[PDB]
Amino acid sequence: GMNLANIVQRGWEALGAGDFDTLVTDYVEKMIFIMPGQADVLKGRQAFRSALDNLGEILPPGFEITGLRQLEGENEIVSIVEWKSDKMIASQLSVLFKFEGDQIYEERWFVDTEQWKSVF
Template sequence: MSAEKQLEDLKGGWAALAAGEMDKLASFYAEDMIFVLPGQDDVLKGRSAFRVALDGISQALPPGFDITDLRYCQGENEIVNIIEFKSDKLPNGSQCAVLFKFGSDSLIIEERWFVDTEQWKAAF
């Protein structure tokens, strides 16, 4: 799969999330994907579990969560997003990173969030 296709698909996934198109978002992921939540000790396995979790996305994000900038850092079959965000309790904003790994079929096989866990908890 080309790096351009990976980038195009990832941007499409973020756009689907912003539009509330959760089925479309889930379509970018492999059936056997894993999603590692902030704190790194809670893992969703499989696209079905991920899709169900997307219905509760507002509870998983801090109140007022708003992405203000996305930067893309590409590697071989992976992209790291640096996310600038703000929320109600973090009005001056903060950053986190999200790793996306792609399988040979062009679908995302792993999504892993890297956050300052204490700051993330305090944002709720």
């Protein structure tokens, strides 16, 4: 099949570029997006695409990825994301992507939420 780590990598670029229409083609319709906290569970690709139109307020001011790498599981990928922002000199988060075939059905962020919320 298609290489999953590559799918993930290219999606970080699409996200960064605001190419949301392209980005969402990587996902199934009945996807779930868990972000930023474990209790923040959004269902469905249309709802995800909608939330992306407010990304500028979902990611903190000046959010920038400074390091990125992918780890591999069984039809799933984890990104380790090194980042900074206007109010954060350096931090890290991780994101799990589970795939149904070659499309993402679960995107689950593991974020220090106390820290995250403080940098908006």
